[PDB]
Design a protein around this ligand. Structure first.
Ligand code: DMA
Ligand code: DMA
Ligand code: DMA
Ligand code: DMA
Ligand SMILES: [Mg+2]
Ligand SMILES: [Mg+2]
Ligand SMILES: [Mg+2]
Ligand SMILES: [Mg+2]
Lengths: 289, 287
């Protein structure tokens, strides 16, 4: 399948705009040079910025204008948190990886101690950024509650815990779904949820947007599993192609994409919702072939 | 002695009360039993709870009584974050310690990976707990901003980064002071600031409360340095006894206690003065 021209236009506008203030902001909110450099290193090493892009596309789809002085820190808090999860995931105690985002991993460059602290620093800074701007306190509190719920011991960290415990266990698919929903699903759910909070989405619209979000999070993970096989064994077993075969994984991807599209078709049509729908064109459903 | 009995009586009442809902609360907020066990193990292994005790003492000195439905999760959020910091500090990549709070460290019991996640889980859960009750949103947001500022890369974590970077380095005292204010001062400053927030302290009283908070946090560190040195050469040099000798360190402790007592004198009522002053009795006995 092909990437939608809408999505190309959207990322060309937003990726550089979201990225530009990162280095100055992280440094401004730090009181240690090396810590600042370590946190920034992992954030700037690369990244599709899928999570904050989703937040912005959600906001736009609610007719709400992104204002950098009000919205940039809260939106990019999610990217700080996502980046922290990657630093800790690569650590010697965890996955013990040498490369991340095409660069040496944080601990290889700074030491395992400083890498651990860079992760802790980014996790914490995320909550400072959610509450750093002139947004209503009700909206700030809702963001914090949502992010902590998505990121913590019922969400991303629970998923990471399950991953430790499943390292040499061939999981049934039903159990793998629960793991995925915590480990990767929850921050993608939050990405959209944050846009609903910032855009003050009427309550009646929440189910359709969040069904879209959950479907996007599931498609993301199935595609990541597919990419692990096609692109450049016991943990390969706990993947969609590991459970279902490559064709079966790709059928799951196709079904999930359609399910998310169907969810959004519940809301009134608009060009901005067409932009949001177009995020599914990130997933090439012909990559298996 | 009398003042010491006052502090001990406060702790005997409040520590069991504050601890009681912890196991059930952490479990309710988790979706992995092993993770919950690892988080709960380090929180319940012990701890003087000085940080949430300071919050309670501050709020009640301002005339706001502790209400469990409103206040328990937000107050104990500070203790979850404090506990996270200890777990990560003990890790093989950091201090590589075998015992914490009278028990084997988290990574000895659960492994380094799960201990790292237990710290991450506690840090994140702290922010959920701050915003978990139905306190006014202005208060919730103020607590989150204050805690993240105290705990993050300008506060605690920055203090920890300076500690890594000074492992085999003889720091000048002026640098050591900055390191201390970040590493241990910041969360103790927050302990009192959280009480000002929850107690809706009048704005003119903030300076006296926070001068007290800073003196307490400074004294806490000097006392910790003193006790470490009493109970190789690279370890001891970046401490108060290392810089000033044990006599000078003790003189610094005594002067800092007096400064904190002086700060409290600027509060408008005797009841406020006496409530927080009992915390300096902590230094009058041994651990
Ligand atoms: C499974 C998982 C969470 C992978 C990293 O996420 P990503 O593919 O969005 O990475 P990046 O942030 O590097 O684009
Ligand atoms: C929350 C998080 C960072 C998950 C990454 O999981 P993984 O180790 O399966 O993916 P990757 O190959 O990106 O490390
Ligand atoms: C240097 C430092 C922050 C030590 C632990 O503080 P603490 O003595 O308050 O620990 P506990 O929570 O075990 O009472
Ligand atoms: C924030 C934090 C946990 C600091 C620990 O300092 P330390 O390692 O000197 O104290 P301890 O002797 O309690 O590990
Ligand atoms: Mg990994
Ligand atoms: Mg992993
Ligand atoms: Mg230590
Ligand atoms: Mg240490």
């Amino acid at each position: 399948s092909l990437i939608n021209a809408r999505l190309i236009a959207f990322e060309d506008q937003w990726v550089p705009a979201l990225n530009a203030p990162l280095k100055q902001a992280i440094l401004a909110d730090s009181q240690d040079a090396q810590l600042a450099a370590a946190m920034t290193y992992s954030v700037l090493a690369g990244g599709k910025r899928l999570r904050p892009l989703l937040t912005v596309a959600t906001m736009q789809s609610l007719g709400v204008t992104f204002v950098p002085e009000r919205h940039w820190r809260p939106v990019m808090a999610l990217e700080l948190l996502h980046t922290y999860s990657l630093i800790h995931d690569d650590l010697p105690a965890m996955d013990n990886d040498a490369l991340r985002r095409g660069e040496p991993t944080n601990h290889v460059k700074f030491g395992a101690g400083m890498a651990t602290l860079a992760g802790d620093g980014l996790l914490t800074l995320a909550f400072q950024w959610l509450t750093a701007t002139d947004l209503p306190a009700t909206m700030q509190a809702a963001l914090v509650q949502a992010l902590a719920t998505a990121a913590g011991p019922s969400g991303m960290v629970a998923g990471q815990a399950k991953d430790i415990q499943s390292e040499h266990v061939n999981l049934p698919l039903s159990q793998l779904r629960v793991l995925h929903k915590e480990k990767t699903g929850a921050l993608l759910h939050y990405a959209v949820q944050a846009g609903l909070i910032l855009g003050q989405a009427p309550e009646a619209q929440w189910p359709a947007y969040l069904q879209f979000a959950d479907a996007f999070g599931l498609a993301f993970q199935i595609y990541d599993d597919i990419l692990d096989v096609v692109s450049s064994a016991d943990e390969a077993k706990n993947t969609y192609p590991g459970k279902l075969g490559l064709i079966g994984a790709n059928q799951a991807l196709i079904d999930t994409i359609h399910s998310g599209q169907a969810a959004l078709q519940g809301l009134p049509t608009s060009t901005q919702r067409d932009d949001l729908a177009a995020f599914f064109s990130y997933f090439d459903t012909e990559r298996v072939n």
